[PDB]
Design brief:
This is part of a larger assembly, with chains A and B.
Chain A: H1 42-55, H2 62-65, H3 71-91
Helix pairs in contact in A: 1-3
Chain B: no helix or strand
The chains are: A mainly alpha, B little secondary structure.
Modified residues (Phosphoserine) (chain B): 7, 26
Cross-link (Glycyl lysine isopeptide (Lys-Gly) (interchain with G-Cter in ubiquitin)) (chain B): 13, 19, 23, 33, 45, 49
Protein name (chain B): Microtubule-associated protein tau
Chain lengths: 111, 49
């Protein structure tokens, strides 16, 4: 509620809580944080610009096709990755706004 | 009498290069596939009869 630009709103309330009796060694209390945020897509983009800089020239690739691999396999691969960056772009700034479907239906007006 | 010899010629073949192909990987690939197609996934049908 104090950092709402850090959470998605079309997915209500974002967290599952669990409360265990048993902290780790030597310690009063703790917790793990795990999460997925729209930030993460930089990993996939990073890998992809760095892969493309090899593959556009087939550099290092001979070690790969040396074990019987086909260049199209990495084409199907990279396109699966750029579809993933496209998916976090579908969900990046996606609108929590309302939507509806409406009757095209009128009245005898007198007001 | 003509006195003997006094004539050699040089052991010489000039050097050149032929059929040395410029086979560098600098433009070694051209192939592409798009990062998936455009789709809508955010909306309900609202099909209440």
């Amino acid at each position: 509620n104090k950092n709402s630009s850090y959470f998605v709103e079309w997915i209500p309330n974002n967290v599952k809580t669990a409360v265990c009796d048993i902290p780790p060694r030597g310690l009063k209390m703790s917790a793990t944080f795990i999460g997925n945020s729209t930030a993460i897509q930089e990993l996939f983009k990073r890998i992809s610009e760095q892969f493309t800089a090899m593959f556009r020239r087939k550099a290092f690739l001979h070690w790969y096709t040396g074990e019987g691999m086909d260049e199209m396999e990495f084409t199907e691969a990279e396109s699966n990755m750029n579809d993933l960056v496209s998916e976090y772009q579908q969900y990046q700034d996606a609108t929590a706004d309302e939507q509806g479907e409406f009757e095209e239906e009128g009245e005898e007006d007198e007001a | 009498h003509v006195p003997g010899g006094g004539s050699v010629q040089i052991v010489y073949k000039p050097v050149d290069l032929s059929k040395v192909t410029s086979k560098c990987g600098s433009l070694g690939n051209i192939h592409h596939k798009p990062g998936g197609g455009q789709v809508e996934v955010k909306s309900e049908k609202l099909d209440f009869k």
